[PDB]
Design a protein around this ligand. Structure first.
Ligand SMILES: Brc1ccccc1Oc1cccnn1
Ligand SMILES: Brc1ccccc1Oc1cccnn1
Ligand code: NA
Ligand code: NA
Lengths: 330, 330
């Protein structure tokens, strides 16, 4: 039912956006079909974890506060696709960075990123035109999108001096995860589920924000270890954190427990595309028992998650039920 | 006074945005100074025609409807920088297209474009938090920004079939100018001046929209001719429309009055970087007396502008005074 309802609202959102271009923006059929294919390519195929989370939060809050049910569930589906379209926008922007007479494919890629972001505003201005939360929804959405761009600046420039392993600390790693990932992947779906369910001021946002940062931290730590050790055919992609000199959990943890001579070996091999220098870094990670510390670190984080949900259910019982389902997905 | 007030509000906007990053987004001083320099580089140095137009519309409407004066003038300055920041965002996106181990300069350029756009929302959500028009201002702003991205798709793909000179018509040229340029350069400053002056529903938006498209058309036609004939040291840049196979006013006008054999010579030379093929295209433009038709076309457009302002002053006299000043700038 939830996935089937989420996909029906996608067709409704897509048909409005394309017809709006056809009727109000003077677009020709060739470009409408071009944008339909681009929308399907960039927005569909994922797991829709962010979008479905908005639905799960909405349905749990109407079970513990007829016509208001069908409207709130539909409003949550539009908000779910706002995040999915926003994620598709971030992914297109990421493809432009590593992808490199005007090059029309780069022009269309940049244009795709602008259209995907603008579509989040257009679908919200339309389906929520008569909603009292439309102003507050756009402001929290824009602020979280701004947060993500700030986190990308932290992540991209973690190895230099913005006109270098000094910022390779655990607190800066959390700052990167918090702004670059946790806010729009974990906090934003929960907030949007509260907004459409009219139960925004009924929750302790401090514990809600704290759980979102902790769950995003738990997910990013596991994602860092898999990027290094999980082979490509099982991970689904090629792990490239070592070559790209990313501020990963493995890097900042290794630097705290490595000897002075091992740090020199790590610095001399980190951030290189050479096959042996990457293997030398993986060897240093192995010999430091980092995958042993990974299990304990996630266990301690999981305990903080398993216990912070209880603070949230004392005043918001139904809200904590969906947060548990979101944590179980992680 | 207007330019001096516009620059004082810039310092106020910049200081808030950077302090917000420092206080609420956990940003280090090295990156704050990095973003201050980037903001000054991308947002300052232009002519501020879009930003100052918002101020001129605001001051003309308070002269023909104490504390409300200083607030409206300040609100117009924030709206003026919203457009300037938006223009700076478009310019950064344009530099990424022709600019082409992770390349950190492309990553920062993409990050710059996202931050400049988000800053328009942040400065509006802050300085207009207690304004009744904040919701309507964001929606019209987002819709015009969406319009610009649609116009960029029309412009970029005017020579191919979105997965070719058929779309090289005068009506499609107007469509490109209308969506890509006229809406955010001419219509948006006028609308924002009306919003901060509380006189939005007091004007005939049909004539206002019509004047905006005509003025943007008048400006783009002159800009097309200068891109081809004005030498680089006098134009300020290198004209590249012929090499880039742009759907310029010269191209669509030439194709209507050229012989069948001249069209074959135009098609065989258009869109090439060869120095002689570009000169062959300029020769075809010269021999067709296109710079003679350019004077008459602009004169007819100027007549439609000089006469549509009169329809607007019968119900909005003070509003048409600023539209005349904006047209005089063109
Ligand atoms: Br939300 C969410 C729920 C469960 C597990 C992970 C989650 O975050 C992401 C991040 C990237 C891609 N897909 N999901
Ligand atoms: Br607004 C405006 C007023 C007068 C003349 C032109 C205008 O538009 C542009 C376009 C690009 C750069 N600068 N100004
Ligand atoms: Na998702
Ligand atoms: Na301007």
């Amino acid at each position: 039912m939830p996935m089937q309802m989420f996909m029906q609202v996608y067709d409704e959102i897509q048909m409005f956006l394309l017809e709006e271009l056809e009727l109000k923006f003077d677009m020709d059929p060739n470009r409408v079909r071009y944008l339909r294919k681009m929308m399907d390519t960039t927005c569909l195929g994922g797991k829709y974890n962010r979008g479905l989370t908005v639905i799960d939060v909405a349905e749990s809050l109407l079970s513990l506060s007829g016509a208001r049910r069908k409207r709130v569930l539909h409003d949550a589906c539009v908000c779910g696709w706002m995040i999915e379209f926003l994620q598709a926008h971030y992914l297109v922007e990421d493809d432009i960075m590593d992808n490199s007479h005007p090059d029309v494919t780069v022009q269309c890629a940049i244009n795709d990123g602008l259209l995907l972001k603008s579509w989040t505003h257009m679908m919200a201005m339309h389906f929520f035109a008569d909603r009292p939360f439309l102003q507050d929804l756009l402001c929290r959405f824009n602020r979280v999108d701004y947060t993500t761009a700030v986190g990308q600046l932290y992540d991209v420039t973690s190895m230099f001096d913005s006109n270098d392993f000094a910022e390779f600390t655990l607190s800066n790693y959390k700052r990167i995860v918090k702004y670059k990932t946790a806010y729009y992947t974990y906090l934003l779906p929960l907030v949007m589920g509260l907004i459409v369910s009219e139960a925004l001021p009924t929750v302790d946002m401090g514990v809600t924000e704290e759980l979102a940062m902790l769950m995003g931290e738990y997910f990013q730590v596991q994602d860092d270890v898999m990027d290094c050790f999980t082979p490509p055919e099982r991970l689904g992609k090629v792990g490239t954190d070592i070559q790209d000199a990313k501020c990963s959990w493995l890097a900042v943890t290794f630097l705290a427990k490595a000897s002075s001579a091992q740090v020199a070996e790590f610095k001399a091999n980190y951030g290189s595309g050479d096959s042996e220098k990457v293997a030398t870094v993986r060897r240093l990670y192995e010999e430091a028992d980092l995958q042993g510390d990974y299990v304990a670190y996630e266990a301690a984080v999981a305990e903080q998650v398993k216990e912070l949900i209880e603070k949230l259910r004392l005043c918001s019982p139904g809200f904590a039920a969906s947060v548990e389902t979101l944590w179980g997905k992680t």
